Design a protein around this ligand. Structure first.
Ligand code: B12
Ligand SMILES: [Cl-]
Ligand SMILES: [Cl-]
Ligand SMILES: [Cl-]
Length: 205
């Protein structure tokens, strides 16, 4: 019962209208002696999915979703500061608003020994630095919604052009769970949310 009590308290403070929510959440969890890693890698993912399922069933509104995940995003940021050879480039495409999952991915990958650099909406000359050498062993793209899929295909195409097809590109996100075949048009080398498959297929360890 206890783990669901703790998640519900994470969700209740995240969704709640009253301020200071994540400072209060951090105090209560550490007073309960939940360590920082499992706050990061277990509770915040689990509370995020429970918030998502609460929206599926029309029990919380869009703005509650917006404030709760942005708060959990704020908490996850601070926890990863406290607790920390291949390198991947993790790209959040322009106008992609589902961003918590890529933070969870980067911390998972770093824990498995893969260095990650997270970039938001990189242009052609943002990318072109980072592909002019063999600096990154792969690029990773998150995609949350169908209206981002065309922008993701342009990213893969532009990544392919700045390297003549030699940059390996994996795609994950909330789209992959529902409709992974919708990203099969983008020309990525790999469409999965399984990080062990990304790691094995690109040989990142
Ligand atoms: C939270 C959420 C949002 C939040 C985002 C909060 C944030 N800052 O991150 C907000 C409120 C911004 C939001 C709004 C939108 N989103 Co929304 N919302 C959701 C919701 C409820 C949960 C998604 C979530 O956070 N899941 C939990 C996270 C942790 O999982 P994840 O993101 O999938 O990431 C995991 C995996 O995908 C994987 N992973 C992620 N990225 C990558 C990358 C790689 C390379 C790999 C290997 C793995 C990987 O690892 C992660 C952890 O396991 C879902 C519905 C649902 N899923 O139940 C939608 C959903 C994704 N949203 C959707 C939509 C449509 C939107 C909007 C684009 C438009 C709209 N009409 O709402 C807007 C954004 C633009 C706008 N505002 O106009 C749709 C997408 C389907 C579609 N397009 O038809 C969904 C599915 C809801 C729905 N059924 O309508 N959303
Ligand atoms: Cl601490
Ligand atoms: Cl939504
Ligand atoms: Cl980290």
């Amino acid at each position: 019962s206890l783990q669901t009590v703790l998640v519900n308290r994470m969700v209740e403070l995240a969704t709640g209208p009253e301020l200071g929510a994540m400072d209060l959440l951090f105090d209560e969890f550490r007073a309960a002696h939940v360590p920082v890693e499992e706050m990061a890698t277990h509770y915040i993912p689990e509370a995020a999915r429970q918030i998502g399922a609460a929206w599926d069933s029309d029990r919380i509104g869009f703005a509650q979703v917006t404030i709760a995940i942005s708060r959990l995003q704020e908490l996850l940021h601070a926890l990863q500061t406290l607790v920390t050879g291949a390198t991947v480039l993790l790209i959040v495409p322009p106008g992609e608003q589902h961003t918590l999952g890529a933070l969870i991915v980067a911390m998972e990958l770093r824990r498995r020994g893969v260095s990650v650099r997270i970039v938001f909406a990189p242009g052609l000359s943002d990318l072109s630095r980072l592909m002019a050498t063999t600096r990154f062993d792969a690029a990773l793209i998150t995609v949350g919604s169908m209206d981002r899929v065309e922008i993701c295909a342009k990213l893969v195409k532009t990544l392919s052009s700045l390297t003549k097809g030699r940059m390996r590109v994996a795609i994950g996100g909330a789209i992959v769970s529902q409709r992974a075949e919708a990203l099969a048009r983008t020309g990525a080398d790999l469409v999965t949310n399984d990080l062990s498959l990304v790691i094995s297929e690109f040989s990142l360890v």
